[PDB]
Automatic annotation (TrEMBL), chain A:
<feature type="binding site">
    <location>
        <position position="178"/>
    </location>
    <ligand>
        <name>acetyl-CoA</name>
    </ligand>
</feature>
<dbReference type="InterPro" id="IPR042113">
    <property type="entry name" value="P_AcTrfase_dom1"/>
</dbReference>
<feature type="binding site">
    <location>
        <position position="92"/>
    </location>
    <ligand>
        <name>acetyl-CoA</name>
    </ligand>
</feature>
<feature type="binding site">
    <location>
        <position position="95"/>
    </location>
    <ligand>
        <name>acetyl-CoA</name>
    </ligand>
</feature>
<protein>
    <recommendedName>
        <fullName>Phosphate acetyltransferase</fullName>
        <ecNumber>2.3.1.8</ecNumber>
    </recommendedName>
</protein>
<dbReference type="GO" id="GO:0008959">
    <property type="term" value="F:phosphate acetyltransferase activity"/>
</dbReference>
<keyword id="KW-0808">Transferase</keyword>
<comment type="pathway">
    <text>Metabolic intermediate biosynthesis; acetyl-CoA biosynthesis; acetyl-CoA from acetate: step 2/2.</text>
</comment>
<comment type="similarity">
    <text>Belongs to the phosphate acetyltransferase and butyryltransferase family.</text>
</comment>
<dbReference type="InterPro" id="IPR002505">
    <property type="entry name" value="PTA_PTB"/>
</dbReference>
<feature type="binding site">
    <location>
        <position position="138"/>
    </location>
    <ligand>
        <name>acetyl-CoA</name>
    </ligand>
</feature>
<dbReference type="InterPro" id="IPR004614">
    <property type="entry name" value="P_AcTrfase"/>
</dbReference>
<dbReference type="InterPro" id="IPR050500">
    <property type="entry name" value="Phos_Acetyltrans/Butyryltrans"/>
</dbReference>
<dbReference type="InterPro" id="IPR042112">
    <property type="entry name" value="P_AcTrfase_dom2"/>
</dbReference>
<keyword id="KW-0012">Acyltransferase</keyword>
<feature type="domain" description="Phosphate acetyl/butaryl transferase">
    <location>
        <begin position="6"/>
        <end position="330"/>
    </location>
</feature>
<feature type="binding site">
    <location>
        <position position="153"/>
    </location>
    <ligand>
        <name>acetyl-CoA</name>
    </ligand>
</feature>
Length: 337, 339
């Protein structure tokens, strides 16, 4: 119930600017059920990957009545197979892919799905109900690649807290909580800019980005603090339109009275709604403790920094969670154009 | 507030039942004196104040405090044990190049004198930092009192009283190291784990189950940074076979039975943790503050651990009630150290 209002807004913005979303796991029942609801509610235009007769059989078997307009693409046989094979070789031959092996890969639903998006025949992709994170992300990084002026992808969570005096009515975006173990200064700056733009695209927030540390504005100098200082500088340079400040402690980021004392004349401190963590140790631990010990609702991870949005579901994701992640993906696609 | 109030009441009561001698080096600081007055009224501890006797008595009369006539006041410039404490200080710090000339200056510094009083067995613990920096409190404590048997590192723990009563002990977890060591080695992290578990036992009447946290659970995400937590876990288990310590694990595996069953089957900690050990100060400093603010948890501390006799450091903005509370904690640490 925390963040059902925001998710309702995300669904509506998807509905108002309809994106084409590829679901490579076209025989997975949770995926198909979610696809049926998304098409009933006209949230997105669905593309399912699988043998056409098998997918249609499974749709009829699950009693789904809203998928007649879904496009179904058999990776073994479809009119753009050679085109996508040629595109794949163009992207990946140099990197050791033979035409022999390109012909195999193009028949793998995850690779095919990424090539559909990359070609401009779709706007985004969701998988991972029946694949590992790595098998989803790898083709996405190889084929779709990163957005202009970015070399790294990262994972953000929407963190809907019960503390409505922080963030946007209790919501903060937090990153990187899933992908990069130990970002360099450069990576951390890219995380900062990416998360701010996700904040704008998904949460309709005016981002104020806190680059977190155990130091605030030189209070605790150390090797680990220097990286966050450099990251802050480089983020500010990469994006002069965005409010980004650091290094600061979490209390300076969130609490006006502490901001006044330790970070005076920051335009972020005391008002942060985006938190950038210096390592995955920090991010992975911190968001889970806020989720459990704070009773916060965490939505994600949401992958950011891709030229076109790919998201990765968990293997235990509900129908409603798949629906939700597709709606988010559509919003990321709108932002990417 | 109300989350911590039952346990803090127990801590004060256990102090009252075995009265310890606590040194307050900042003997003219008004918040400290007010707290000392309440502690003496309530018979929580025997207070020792450091300062010129006439000045301290003048300040006591000036603040209208009626319960400090039995407080011991030691003037650092002139008191019966000055040469004894000076000789002790030279004996501890001669190797390290302290001259008798410089010993004679240091022994007159209230923070050094306070530590020598404890070290000599003339007190049981010390509290300062209302008017001194953390570093000026810690330095004499580490030089004079030093670390407990079998420990080389001192760390800081918080009592974290959360609103999630289904975790920890009715919502309480101890977390460390959240204040002192920026980047513990594997050995330091193991010592943090054993120290915090024993603090948990002594202060919070917790049966410690210690989770060594990482972004990996039992080899799920192997990496350079996870290796330190794996090694720390092994070394902690070896140092303390009487304690339940496991790792590496994620915070969800530490706290959630359903996740523990999947990611850490046959841990005797996972899903039941009540002590969390963080791999770095970045993690600890950020994580406890986010839980405090975003979770509405109450955090008490930092509490210093690993000292041969307890020294605690107050913040410069600490209330009278917070000083009272920290003195009660320190007395409980002394009771644990003597046992
Ligand atoms: C390694 C650990 O288990 S600890 C980290 C804990 N976190 C996670 O596991 C979550 C996901 N982490 C990952 O590493 C992802 O699963 C993966 C898919 C990016 C790793 O991919 P790998 O199987 O290592 O393949 P490899 O790194 O050889 O190739 C993946 C491609 O993406 C690139 N890449 C890897 N990480 C990133 C990133 N964060 N951003 C952008 N590109 C990346 C690689 O350079 C490579 O590109 P290339 O083939 O064009 O050179
Ligand atoms: C503040 C920064 O720049 S780093 C990042 C943030 N850190 C913090 O917020 C924590 C605050 N901590 C501190 O002030 C320091 O860590 C201190 C006080 C513990 C150490 O600083 P100093 O008192 O100047 O110690 P210094 O480095 O001068 O001397 C080291 C001595 O203390 C000892 N020591 C230092 N830290 C510790 C510790 N955590 N545990 C045990 N012993 C210690 C050394 O072994 C050495 O002993 P010796 O006198 O017998 O040689």
């Amino acid at each position: 119930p925390l963040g059902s209002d925001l998710i309702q807004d995300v669904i509506r913005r998807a509905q108002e600017n309809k994106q084409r979303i590829v679901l490579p796991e076209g025989l997975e029942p949770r995926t198909l059920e979610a696809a049926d609801r998304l098409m009933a509610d006209k949230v997105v235009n669905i593309i399912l990957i699988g043998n056409v007769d098998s997918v249609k059989a499974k749709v009829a078997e699950l009693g789904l009545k809203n998928l007649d307009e879904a496009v179904i693409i058999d990776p073994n046989n479809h009119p753009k197979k050679q085109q996508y094979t040629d595109l794949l070789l163009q992207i990946r031959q140099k990197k050791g892919l033979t035409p022999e092996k390109a012909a195999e890969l193009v028949e793998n639903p995850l690779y095919l799905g990424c090539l559909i998006v990359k070609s401009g025949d779709a706007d985004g992709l969701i998988a991972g109900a029946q694949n590992t994170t790595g098998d989803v992300l790898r083709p996405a990084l190889q084929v779709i690649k990163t957005a202009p002026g970015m070399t790294s992808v990262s994972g953000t969570f929407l963190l809907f807290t019960k503390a409505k005096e922080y963030g946007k009515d209790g919501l903060l975006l937090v990153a990187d909580c899933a992908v990069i173990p130990n970002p360099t200064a450069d990576e951390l700056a890219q995380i900062a800019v990416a998360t701010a733009r996700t904040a704008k695209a998904i949460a309709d927030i005016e981002p104020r980005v806190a680059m977190l540390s155990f130091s605030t504005k030189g209070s605790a100098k150390h090797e680990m603090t220097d990286k966050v200082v450099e990251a802050t500088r480089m983020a500010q340079e990469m994006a002069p339109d965005l409010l980004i400040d650091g290094e600061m402690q979490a209390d300076a980021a969130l609490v006006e009275r502490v901001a006044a004392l330790k970070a005076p004349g920051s335009n972020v401190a005391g008002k942060a709604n985006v938190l950038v963590f210096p390592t995955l140790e920090v991010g992975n631990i911190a968001y889970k403790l806020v989720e459990r010990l704070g009773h916060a609702e965490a939505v994600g991870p949401i992958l950011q920094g891709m030229a076109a949005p790919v998201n990765d579901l968990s293997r235990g994701c509900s129908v409603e969670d798949i629906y939700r992640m597709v709606a988010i993906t559509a919003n990321q696609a709108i932002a990417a154009k």
